[PDB]
Design a protein around this ligand. Structure first.
Ligand SMILES: Nc1nc2c(ncn2[C@@H]2O[C@H](COP(=O)(O)OP(=O)(O)O)[C@@H](O)[C@H]2O)c(=O)[nH]1
Lengths: 42, 430
């Protein structure tokens, strides 16, 4: 029998692990009188 | 920023021979010593490991010490043996006998003066000296005794530099030497006071690496020593080539050691690919990271799942984005948060270098500081106590002149190191 390393794999990763490629995202927050009178007269 | 190498004993001389073959290949140095390389990037840092002799030649900054010249005759007869300076070979006339007391006290005091004169001549020649690098086994006789003697003398001479050791440690399943527990315990006692950073390798882990990962049909010690030479030449790569995030041996020490006694690390090298499967997996930073954390790729018997990481370091070689490195290190820290010590906010340091090793698109070397190393010392202390209570082979050491009190000091110091690791593993914020 061949001997073995006594350590088993636990840590796992993946490619492109971030959400939508962004580290973090901000939440959405919603949102007188009469004038002077004159004219031609006589 | 120059490194000085010391090779001691049979294991040290053989690993050194393979290391200098790998380094001469990466910088394009002919075995005659003539530069025949093809890029200025190779020449501009050649001084880091080679001194220049007249009319083109380069000589390697290494001291070879052994008590019987048989191994040295084998390395001088080897294909690159001519490069070594004849005056750099120091030898006695009788072997160490695998006995620590003989190697440290009788032939040690006889030869040590010539080794210190060669080491001082080699160190002073540097324009600015970086730390020393030593390769030896702890289970042997001249490796353990002369390595720890020379380390103590160099620490007296050059206390402000770095002291780095690569060390072979006894396998948990089969011994290569019967008196291994005494030599290992006394050597670890010497190292914890004198050393700044120490890497430990089990031959059993390299055998399992070769058979399971590389599926080699008939491996030889040249392959194991090539894997070791690859990681050894990789840790220093950022010292001697340009990159987007430079790093240095002192920066690794400053980021890896939280407290001065906790300086023992695990080592790994990632791009090992099986002899018939390269078509099944493309090179990528996630693939290197996945192999990087797989315990199958670690060169020690202890497993991370029984401990916690205080700190870790990854050095990347190749043309790659910094975003992928940072997000991979964040994703691994976030997804496996229970295996990282919580009172440190980030345990991994990253570094990026532009020039990969020849024939590989990318490579990374991994250094890890994990509390599971306490399990190895506890096993060695158990075997030491079993042998010492019955005086199993003690008359050799006592007949050479050792006081029994030295054995109790080394046992107490190793037991306190195990206790300190156990206390830091179970510490809490409160
Ligand atoms: N990886 C590796 N281990 C070796 C080599 N030669 C010896 N060893 C190991 O080192 C230990 C023997 O120590 P040794 O070098 O003989 O001590 P010395 O007698 O003082 O030189 C055993 O565990 C061997 O398996 C080698 O070339 N490579």
């Amino acid at each position: 029998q061949h001997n073995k390393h006594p350590g088993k794999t636990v840590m796992f990763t993946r490619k492109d692990p971030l959400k939508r490629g962004l580290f973090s995202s901000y939440p959405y927050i919603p949102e007188a009188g009469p004038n002077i009178k004159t004219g031609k007269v006589n | 920023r120059e490194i000085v190498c010391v090779q001691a004993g049979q294991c040290g001389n053989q690993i050194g021979s393979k290391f200098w073959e790998v380094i001469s290949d990466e910088h394009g140095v002919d075995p005659t010593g003539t530069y025949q390389g093809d890029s200025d990037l190779q020449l501009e840092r050649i001084n880091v490991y080679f001194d220049e002799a007249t009319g083109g030649r380069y000589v390697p900054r290494s001291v070879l010490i052994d008590l019987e010249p048989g191994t040295m005759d084998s390395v001088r007869a080897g294909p690159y043996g001519q490069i070594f300076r004849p005056d750099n070979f120091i030898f006695g006339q009788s072997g160490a006998g695998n006995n620590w007391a003989k190697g440290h006290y009788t032939e040690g005091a006889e030869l040590i003066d010539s080794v210190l004169d060669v080491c001082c001549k080699e160190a002073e020649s540097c324009d600015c000296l970086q730390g020393f690098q030593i390769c030896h086994s702890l289970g042997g006789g001249t490796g353990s005794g002369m390595g720890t003697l020379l380390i103590s003398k160099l620490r007296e001479q050059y206390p402000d530099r770095i002291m780095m050791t690569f060390s072979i440690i006894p396998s948990p399943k089969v011994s290569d030497t019967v008196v291994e527990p005494y030599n290992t315990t006394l050597s670890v006692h010497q190292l914890v006071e004198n050393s700044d950073e120490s890497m430990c390798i089990d031959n059993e882990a390299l055998y399992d690496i070769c058979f399971r990962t590389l599926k080699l049909t008939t491996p030889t010690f040249g392959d194991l020593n090539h894997l070791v030479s690859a990681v050894v030449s990789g840790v220093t790569c950022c010292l001697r080539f340009p990159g987007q995030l430079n790093s240095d041996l002192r920066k690794l020490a400053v980021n890896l050691v939280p407290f001065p006694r906790l300086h023992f690390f695990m080592m790994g090298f990632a791009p090992l690919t099986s002899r018939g499967s390269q078509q099944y997996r493309g090179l990528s930073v996630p693939e290197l990271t996945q192999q990087m954390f797989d315990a199958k790729n670690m060169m020690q018997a202890a497993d991370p799942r029984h401990g916690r990481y205080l700190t870790a370091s990854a050095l990347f070689r190749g043309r790659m984005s910094t975003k992928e490195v940072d997000e991979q290190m964040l994703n691994v820290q976030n997804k496996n948060s229970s295996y990282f010590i919580e009172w440190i906010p980030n345990n991994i340091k990253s570094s990026v270098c532009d020039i990969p090793p020849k024939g590989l698109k990318m490579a990374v070397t991994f250094i890890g500081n994990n509390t599971c190393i306490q399990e190895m010392f506890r096993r060695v202390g158990e075997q030491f106590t079993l042998m010492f209570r019955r005086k199993a082979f003690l008359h050799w050491y006592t007949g050479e002149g050792m006081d029994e009190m030295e054995f109790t000091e080394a046992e107490s110091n190793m037991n306190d190191l195990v206790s300190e690791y156990q206390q830091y593993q179970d510490a809490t914020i409160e």
